[PDB]
């Protein structure tokens, strides 16, 4: 009870750099003689310091080695503090140490070897620190150990194979480390072992069969590892097992039927593995199961009606498997059920009526299956349903009422046969951030109540037959990012209130009856990425105010009545990957600096089917990395600019149906090695056929038909492999027509009329 | 899926003032409906176009997690850090553009194991180190614009560089 301990404690106090809560201040004020009354400090009957316990006291600094000078110390509890540095190597000197708990701190470096020499230590908690190095073989020789936490450190290397020696062990948890190698089989010899967590490591190889010998085992957690082979049937003999987590591994083969023997099981999660065959019916004998999922596996066969027996079941994930046959109608037997996911399977049949029975249901994912039939009206009675994904199925009928009382967030019912109108009560649920009915038969208007759900992020009504105008209520959405109404019968003017969506990154109105002046206000959206107005009744000149949207990856005005000349102002947008102006009334030349200001455009440039007149701008050469250029069906006049020899990413090039004349430059096609389809057809082109056409390896279809080309056909084309369709036709060509090649299966039509060709 | 997760990792490593990546929701089955992301008919990611998005940050290793990735455009951003060697793990990748960035460090030798590569532009960067010889191995390489980042160590003529007009080097502190 004398000075040495006092000095140890003081030297521990010093070295603690920060004490905001002022805990240690107690030590100062009480005095050195009364020290056994100090906060965190407790002594024995004889007056020696035994327990040092300080928890959530927010202490910073380092742990002074002076703690080794407290000899009678049994428990040292530092839990949940800021302590940094390395655990003092002199810690082996305590010898009376019962429990060392460093849990939730910043401690680093290798675990002191001294710790392993202690014969009195049962509870060792190092969890949640920075400790590096490996678990030494020496740990097997410290035999007083019962509970060892290693969780969430930097520990590496392999688990000591001699661990079975650690006879008294009840708990070993290494989870969230870098451990590699396999699981020591000797571990299966610990008969008092309850909890084992190896999860979140690199561990490999098979699960030890002898693990079937642990009869006190409650939690077995191997998840997020590299483990291979199959789940050992021996596991079926652990009767104390409440929780079995094998998920996120390489485990293969069928699920052991013997797993049906663990009836204390609550959580069984084997998901994200290679497992095969069909679910053993024995699994339905586990009636205490709350959480179960088989998802992300190769499992086949049906889902037996016997799932109805589980009844304590809360979360069920069957998704991303090969499951087939009828849907589990008896799913309504489990009223504790919250999450159910069958998605990504071949499951067919109909959802059960009285599905409304579940009530607690939060997530329903049936998406991507063979399910037919109507959405059960009884779904009105699921009041806790946040998420419904029925999308991509064969389902029929009309969307029922009751979605207003569900309080949903995500609804994807799309890609189905659904008919009727959109129930207006569906707008009575304001928490809906996703509404997708896309690709169905739904008919009606889009009512102004749409304005009712302000929280929405994405709205897809596309690929239905809907009609009427677009309600101005649309403006209220505010945070919508995607709006897709395309492929419907919507009519009238685009409401100017759409300018009120400042968060909208895409708009597809295409294939509709929309018309009239595009509202000026709509150009105030700077965040709009993709805009498809194509295939509509829009007329009049292309607004220069289109420049006001400067970030556009995608723009399609195609298939409309648009008037006049391409506004030069459009130079403002250089982010365009796809510009489709094609199929309109557009007149005049292509502005050069617009074609220049698009420098890098990676995909699609289509001006085709317009009244455009002029030479093809040399600035088309400035366009590089562009895959497709269609200028076809226009009034373009002069010869092909050699300037475009600079675009090497061109795959398809269509200049057909034009007034272009002069010789086809070889110099320009040298660059375009990559071309797959080339259409020069129906022009005034004269001179020979470029020999570099033979240097095109990816050329499939080449159409030179209807031209003035005077040359002998170049053989180069003959032996060319990838060529399939060739068009020469009306032209003046001379002499021998090549033999071996696409000329073998060639149709006479492609050569006619050519006048004189020997053959 | 895994690809959506990879791009989500990329998104987490990047500061996005222009809200370009707002479209990216990790909870989706694929990242194919994400803007500035384009996939193929099989839903595997083909193109990623981030060019001129005014992003800032570091690249990520998970960029190797996109087997079908063909065109990768990060060009003209404030992105810093190095070029992950896992970019070599891309089997068919047609165009790699990191140009006009603050990226530093060496050009990984793994950049020579993509044999489908045509356009490689690393130019206008902080890149420092030696040129991988495997860039002479790939042979497709219709364009290599890499320049403006000090490297040296040599200028290889080893024979896929035999075809380069040498703006392709242009102050590499080269040779």
């Amino acid at each position: 009870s004398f000075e040495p301990e006092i000095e140890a404690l003081k030297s521990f106090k010093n070295g603690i750099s920060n004490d905001p809560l002022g805990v240690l201040s107690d030590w100062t004020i009480i005095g050195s003689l009364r020290h056994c009354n100090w906060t965190g400090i407790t002594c024995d009957s004889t007056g020696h310091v035994v327990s040092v316990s300080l928890l959530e006291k927010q202490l910073e600094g380092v742990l002074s080695p002076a703690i080794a000078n407290l000899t009678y110390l049994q428990v040292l509890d530092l839990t949940s503090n800021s302590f940094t540095g390395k655990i003092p190597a002199e810690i082996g000197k305590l010898t009376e140490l019962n429990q060392l708990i460093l849990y939730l701190n910043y401690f680093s470096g290798s675990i002191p070897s001294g710790i392993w020499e202690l014969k009195n230590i049962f509870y060792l908690d190092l969890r949640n620190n920075l400790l590096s190095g490996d678990v030494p073989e020496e740990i097997c020789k410290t035999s007083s150990l019962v509970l060892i936490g290693f969780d969430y450190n930097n520990l590496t290397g392999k688990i000591p194979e001699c661990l079975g020696d650690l006879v008294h062990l009840q708990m070993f948890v290494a989870a969230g480390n870098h451990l590699t190698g396999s699981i020591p089989v000797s571990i299966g010899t610990l008969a008092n072992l309850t909890d084992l967590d190896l999860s979140g490591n690199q561990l490999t190889g098979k699960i030890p069969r002898d693990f079937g010998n642990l009869l006190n085992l409650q939690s077995l957690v191997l998840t997020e590892n590299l483990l291979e082979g199959d789940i050992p049937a021996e596991i079926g003999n652990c009767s104390s097992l409440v929780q079995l987590e094998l998920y996120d591994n390489q485990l293969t083969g069928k699920i052991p039927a013997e797993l049906g023997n663990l009836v204390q099981l609550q959580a069984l999660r084997i998901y994200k593995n290679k497992l095969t065959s069909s679910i053993p019916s024995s699994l339905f004998r586990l009636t205490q199961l709350t959480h179960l999922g088989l998802s992300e596996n190769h499992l086949v066969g049906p889902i037996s009606e016997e799932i109805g027996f589980l009844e304590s079941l809360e979360v069920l994930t069957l998704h991303s498997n090969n499951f087939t046959g009828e849907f589990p109608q008896s799913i309504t037997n489990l009223r504790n059920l919250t999450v159910l996911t069958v998605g990504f399977n071949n499951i067919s049949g109909e959802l059960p009526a009285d599905l409304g029975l579940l009530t607690n249901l939060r997530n329903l994912s049936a998406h991507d299956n063979l399910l037919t039939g109507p959405i059960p009206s009884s779904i009105s009675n699921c009041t806790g349903l946040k998420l419904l994904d029925l999308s991509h199925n064969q389902m029929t009928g009309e969307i029922p009422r009751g979605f207003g009382r569900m309080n949903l967030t995500f609804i994807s019912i799309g890609r189905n046969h659904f008919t009727g109108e959109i129930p207006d009560d569906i707008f009575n649920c304001s928490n809906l951030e996703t509404l997708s009915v896309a690709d169905n038969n739904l008919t009606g208007t889009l009512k102004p109540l749409i304005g009712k759900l302000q929280k929405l992020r994405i709205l897809q009504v596309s690929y239905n037959s809907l009609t009427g105008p677009i309600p101005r209520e649309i403006g209220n959405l505010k945070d919508l990012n995607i709006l897709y109404l395309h492929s419907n019968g919507f009519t009238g003017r685009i409401p100017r209130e759409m300018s009120n969506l400042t968060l909208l990154q895409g708009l597809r109105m295409y294939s509709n009856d929309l018309e009239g002046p595009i509202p000026e206000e709509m150009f105030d959206m700077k965040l709009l990425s993709v805009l498809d107005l194509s295939n509509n009744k829009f007329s009049g000149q292309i607004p220069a105010l289109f420049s006001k949207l400067e970030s556009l990856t995608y723009l399609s005005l195609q298939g409309n009545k648009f008037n006049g000349s391409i506004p030069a102002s459009l130079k403002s947008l250089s982010l365009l990957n796809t510009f489709d102006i094609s199929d309109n009334l557009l007149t005049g030349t292509i502005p050069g600096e617009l074609l220049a200001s698009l420098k890098n455009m990676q995909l699609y440039l289509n001006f085709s089917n317009n009244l455009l007149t002029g030479t093809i701008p040399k600035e088309l050469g400035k366009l590089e990395m562009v895959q497709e250029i269609d200028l076809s069906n226009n009034l373009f006049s002069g010869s092909i600019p050699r300037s475009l020899q600079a675009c090497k990413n061109v795959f398809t090039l269509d200049f057909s149906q034009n007034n272009l004349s002069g010789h086809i430059p070889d110099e320009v096609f040298q660059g375009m090695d990559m071309i797959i389809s080339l259409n020069l057809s129906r022009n005034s082109f004269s001179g020979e056929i470029p020999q570099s056409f033979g240097n095109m390896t990816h050329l499939v279809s080449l159409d030179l038909s209807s031209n003035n080309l005077t040359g002998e056909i170049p053989e180069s084309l003959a032996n060319l492999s990838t060529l399939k369709h060739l068009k020469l036709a009306s032209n003046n060509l001379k002499g021998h027509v090549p033999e071996s090649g696409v000329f073998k299966n060639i149709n006479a039509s492609d050569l006619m009329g050519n006048t004189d060709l020997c053959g | 899926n895994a690809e959506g997760d990879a791009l989500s990792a990329l998104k987490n490593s990047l500061a996005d003032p222009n809200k370009v990546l707002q479209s990216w929701d990790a909870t989706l089955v694929t990242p194919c409906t994400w803007f500035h992301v384009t996939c193929n008919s099989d839903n595997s990611v083909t193109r990623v176009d981030l060019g001129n998005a005014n992003l800032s940050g570091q690249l990520v290793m998970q960029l190797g997690q996109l087997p079908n990735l063909q065109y990768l455009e990060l060009y003209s951003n404030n992105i810093t850090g190095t070029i992950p060697e896992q970019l070599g793990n891309l089997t068919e990748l047609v165009s790699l553009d990191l140009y006009l960035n603050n990226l530093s460090g060496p050009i990984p030798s793994t950049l020579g194991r993509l044999k489908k590569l045509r356009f490689l532009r690393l130019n206008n960067n902080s890149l420092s180190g030696e040129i991988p010889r495997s860039l002479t191995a790939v042979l497709t390489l219709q364009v290599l614009d890499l320049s403006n980042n000090p490297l040296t160590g040599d200028i290889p003529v080893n024979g896929s560089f035999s075809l380069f007009t040498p703006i392709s080097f242009a102050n590499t502190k080269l040779t």
């Binding site: 999860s199 957690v221 994930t317 999308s391 994807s412 996703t434 | -």
Partner: peptide
């Protein structure tokens, strides 16, 4: 969570399912 009470039931996650659009 103390090391004594052991690994609880909710200490492990459920497999989350994707969203179809």
């Amino acid at each position: 969570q103390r090391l004594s009470t052991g690994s609880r039931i909710n200490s492990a996650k459920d497999d989350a399912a994707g969203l179809q659009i």
